[PDB]
């Protein structure tokens, strides 16, 4: 596996951990996080989330300062009578735990009597990992703060990872057909809010404190992403003995099959025939395009690590040729990942670059790497624009196409959407370049 | 006639004297390509006969010439409705325009020969001149065989009709030899060409490695240029045989159902190891292929190909790769799996077609440093077409 | 309004009436139509439907000839033990009604005793009208053949017109939310069939003989398309006194509102708040892109007449500039259509060409018509390819993009899909031409 | 500094000595465009400081120069993390490469003037030379105003900094006049340029028709070329005033909430008829605009514009059309309608913004054959930029 041989960065693929913590927090109902740093950090993270979703979300700042945190909490609780979860997130220049202990004894009991307010800390240094690590540590911190043993429940925990509202809609459809109830972390379908006639409705997360409390009483935890939710699943298994299944990310047909088998084993619920017909519909659509257009297509993939690995596996199943896989942070678990080991074993023409930036892709293209397609998010759009390689927008953030958050990349509907979108991007490129474009008649 | 033979002509307005629905039904359904920007695929002309007509032909003929000023050739087809004087109208149109020629359409062979053949005269005649007959240039087959002929130093007077021009097909009577690709469509053309001008006929095969090599050797033997054919055959064998044998090792014993049945059947068994006879693949048209798709059997289009052209040595390797890709798809095994079965063989990760195919080969084949997979661009005609246009330019300068 | 001043046709927009009759027939369960013409006619219509849907459908031929029709019916009934509806469709060179009278007394009672077989004729000359009028006459003929008075029903009749399976899915979702039962003509969602593991499932229509019989007992008929179903609605109103509402085609927010109001008036069912929320989601997505990218975009539209008119109206609502509307047949009802009169009145830069072909658009572009977008089906793809105008694929047939039949163009989901697809086609064109492509960051 | 002032420089590698997350957050969030293929928007460079670092800077500086061989200018920014010897490292890098210059960065004004200004000399100096200061070329504003200056026969020595080059900003000290667009970002630059070289400062406004015309007239009065400014003003008025007044008639009395607040407020009220204060439109940033979108109020981006540039006379008309399009959208009235109301004003067909806006005007305005809607292409900078590059080529030949 390639590890970036340059020390500097050109065109980073991810942002810092505090941004990932804030994104994890905005998926919780009645949660407004205070970021203990510069106001500019919160401004840019809110701008990034607004770029992805075109929706405004509430994140607070402390404007650096242990006492400034106290004033920020006081101001936030005064000016938001609905907020219940107030996570304090630390940053570059930043004992908030002892200060919160004093706050819950002095400020909350006196100034806000009878108001349910929960204060927690998410320590997110900006020079250690990335937004993936920040999301993982934030999910772990929320689960640790709220999980409480109670009466056993028939629900499972679905830690989705950093996914789109369309992915959550698809996963919940699969669970509903399987007749499985879950504590879904997180319910981000409410990120897409309506333009209502009279009463305004703002974007918010739908994961409640009750869900995070009840995570301790589940039959089991399925964490789809190994780098975005395995820490919370491991914490639950270590403290409350909740059995944890890590992965696979259900990208494509085979990985969705494995996900449904994991759900069936956890819950005892059989896989029904309706999922067989939906899987068959996806497979029929895939058979329309597979060995006519998708086979032998040379692909570069970058995304969140689990999504990128799953996309590479799905492309390999579709008879495509993944050439470059970019993993944009310094995580040491990639080399020991069994999926990465399998990719090394049976896809020898695929180069995997860890701790990568967009210059890895751009310079490899400059030196002669011929590609037909790119799977990546919008910050790498200019490689596609300038080197004339079509790109399908996947992951976070996708701000240069309209409404990509509403479509799934997970499940069978996600597999169908991915395959048909890859085909249609290829068709539009074939027409733009007039490359056998007459062939799109009697396929 | 209008759908298979006449249309591949690249510089002709093919106007149908009849309703729009017949002209619509066959438009953009074929893959006869041309170097004239696929004019024969992009535009289709109808007289648009309505119930009142059951004057208009003359006006629609003039309209088409006006809209396409660079086209001076017209072929008028009579449809079923217009059975109940096209020749005179065509003559008056030619008289009025003054710089256009109109042709009034087995039948289309007799019509073309008895009217249009013998009129135009070739400007330059090479040492070795052939008429390529029965080839209609599906996905670029005619360009493949022209490349092979050019590398042999042979001038192709005209192709009937794929990527063929009107005037070249009028010059059809001054060739030294006629080479037959399809006989069921153009037997009469060459029979009567021999009858009238004494032009010898040479039936050839363009598919496979041995049939194509033998065809090239026969063509060279006619002109006494056997060494050029041998050099072509050696070069193309050295280039494409290891790649073809890579697929032939993984396709030995697979069954193919044929629904291009005899231009294919023996070379497929001999050179790809397939058994022509549940089948592993079916060669058929688009609609029957979509029918058998529901049975878990892949198909390759026998009329329009999939990733064509399938002619030539490289085209044969592309055909083998298409077969292998359809047969060994991981999606094929995923679709045959019933995930609702209690003990369903559900897995995760990925599989490749190579992983499935290598389970069938031996270790000596699996670790061969001679056999390799097909190494060719998605559009293989772009380089062949550029070579063809370079040879035409070079031949112009010498003349 | 422009009427084509050329007598000849260059690049027709529609096929003949028998093709429309066969398409109407393939939407009926256990119906296999015999086409009384050449083998090639059926071969090309089946190829066209296969191009659109990538699925094989059963249509029979007589090959030409009354004895030929009798032999064809005998052979079809022998070789298909499930077919119940056997429409005979006449063509160019073609008393099928008299013979059918004789057949139902001689052949069916003797050779097939106890078998429920219905024989009907659809007369479809190919030198009058087009596939639109053929579809209209086929729907009228089926309704006339089967409609029977019985006990009154609380259902309505929804004659959808020639629409996609995604459109039918959207319409049925709207009806289900409004809690309205319907006799939907036709149920074409089964056109998309799965690739099943063991059993084989083939494409078919889901409209039964019971639905067509029960059309006579409905509370009312809503025919979405005035040129694709108004004849059946008028027949029902004239014979069984079933009140008929013609249009509007629910393309876009406003026309979907009018459709839901028509349903509410027919049935007495109130419009619920869930439809308000879904309409608001579509409107929020539309507000993300409207006055930033959609406003002032110059559009050419050709489709089936009702869909084309509705698309023009939706584009006008989106602040776009429709320049050309192509209506591809010789229907005399276009000039008296109130929608067309409104377009003439309040859309002054829109030229409407009736009896048009694709040369109308192509020559207008040649003479200097500047366009930003085209809405049309795949037979006009080469205008888009060669003149570098992006096209969104709408209508029938759309064979050069993957799975377009599965998306709606009707309803609020259809409005969202349309608006976001036009936005994304424009975005891809902006990137291909490098036309202010840097602007796709902070919209 | 880095995010607003330094970055618009088009031919410089802006490398941040710090973590990747800070470099990522400001990347592709601005609309400072340039004629250098938007290099300043496409590439962003970080030293990538890790926990261990809390040698690397020198190597990252060399890597960036290697990857972009056509870029010889570098600006190194110190982030919060690296506050716990960049100058010496920059000198060593310059010594080793030998053909590059490095700059170590209110503060950015002191840094540039005391380090870089005065080190380069222009080869040619026109009769009338200005420094355009405080302009950062949002969507093409700098190129709009350069076109206006070129048509006046004025040479712009440098723009600080939008679509500006490193060497021009080092040559900034030999201008006859400084024209100041923004003062809250570049006051000190002009004060110290006057202090050190006695260069007069002329504050100007580029928005509106009267503020821009008065700015052009003052610039012409300084150089005694008033007739050229008058000709420009007359031509642009004749071209764009009927189009602007078309929108001003339909925007009289509408309310705007401002969240470019005084560069705009008076000209908006005077020339567009809007009342600056439920508002009819809000001028704000992207995230607050998306917040107020939920309240049924449209927004125009006050920082990056919507369909810019908003500078110039044509840019003012584009701004008016953007306001009118947002305010009079038929979707705005569709979204405010509650279709679940028992008697809801549900309609069919369509409406246009013109239909909604014409309900507010009188019949004399509605049927004016003088006022017309905006007639301009989607990208208005392509023609202005091509004009600018032609004047540069013509001026180069004369020299
Ligand atoms: S126009 Fe249509 S396909 Fe043509 S012979 Fe006539 S019915 Fe048939
Ligand atoms: S400073 Fe702030 S955005 Fe993230 S947490 Fe620092 S890297 Fe800057």
Residue numbers in the entry:
A (entry chain D), C (entry chain B): 5 to 68, 77 to 106, 112 to 460
B (entry chain A), D (entry chain C): 54 to 107, 113 to 142, 146 to 166, 181 to 334, 339 to 356, 398 to 519
What does the paper say about this structure?
Nitrogenases catalyze a key step in the global nitrogen cycle by reducing molecular nitrogen (dinitrogen, N2) to ammonia (NH3). Some diazotrophs encode ‘back-up’ or alternative nitrogenase genes: vnfHDGK for the vanadium (V) nitrogenase or anfHDGK for the iron (Fe) nitrogenase, expressed upon the depletion of Mo. Upon complex formation, low-potential electrons are transferred from the [Fe4S4] cluster of the reductase component via an [Fe8S7] relay (P-cluster) to the active site cofactor of the catalytic component.
To examine if the αIII domain flexibility is observed or even amplified in the resting state of the catalytic component, we tried to solve the cryo-EM structure of Anf(DGK)2. Using identical conditions as for the AlF3-trapped complex, particle orientation had a strong bias for top views on AnfD. To circumvent the preferred orientation problem, we collected another data set of the catalytic component with CHAPSO detergent added right before plunge freezing of the grids. The use of detergent mitigated the preferred orientation problem, and we obtained a cryo-EM map with a global resolution of 2.49 Å.
